[PDB]
Amino acid sequence: GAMGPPSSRDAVRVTASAHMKHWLEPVLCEAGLGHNYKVDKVLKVLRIYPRSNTLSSLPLCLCDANYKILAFANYKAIAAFERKERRRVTQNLLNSEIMIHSFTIRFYNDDQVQGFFDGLKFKQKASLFPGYLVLEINDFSMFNRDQLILSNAGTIEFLYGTPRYIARFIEQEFSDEE
């Protein structure tokens, strides 16, 4: 007395082929992104601190392929996931993979990151100017449906000591010259 028909004609086929790639290196050199730039890449988030706003999107910590930076999504980007998925993205949607359509570079200091997170303290080794690279998510979308975590984030280094990041954004101008 067998029961339950086979799943073939009624069911569909799923492949899903996507792997993490290093864009932090080429983006700052090959792409030379700066003030106004827009590229498509994958990003993984490891920590999120929900707020009373109940927008399902707030300042969170993410780790890329080469380094881990701090970033926050704009309301325009926040409302997007709500319309397309009508669910909390910060839960498991962000952890999987995200494709940012547009993003802008921003500098953050010890005080800025403090308020940005529950109380994460970043050491810049005695610095007056901001040495933290923070991105902005104006509009993003779910790239990979599958849920995966960046287990290689531990081996990844920090941008706080990267001479390239500091030289490209800080060494550009320091003295007022006036």
Query: What is the C-alpha to C-alpha distance for residues 84 and 178, in angstroms, rounded to an integer?
Result: 51
The encoded tokens of residue 89 equal 């993205």
Q: Are 64 and 127 in contact (CB under 8 A)?
A: no
Q: Is the dihedral of CA 152, 153, 155, 158 positive or negative?
A: positive
- For 60, 160, 178, the CA distances from 107, given in Å and listed in that order, are 16, 12, 23
- For 34, 60, 99, 110, 115, the CA distances from 118, given in Å and listed in that order, are 29, 10, 26, 13, 7
Nearest by Cα to 77 from 68, 90, 61, 65: 90
Give strand pairing partners of 169: none
Give the start-to-end residue ranges of the domains of the chain: 1-178
- For 5, 20, 146, the CA distances from 170, given in Å and listed in that order, are 65, 29, 38
Q: Is 4 exposed, middle or buried (0-12, 13-18, 19+ CB in 10 A)?
A: exposed
Give the technique used to solve this structure.
NMR
H-run or E-run covering 137: strand 132-137
Helices (H), 15-135: 24-26, 75-85, 89-96, 110-116
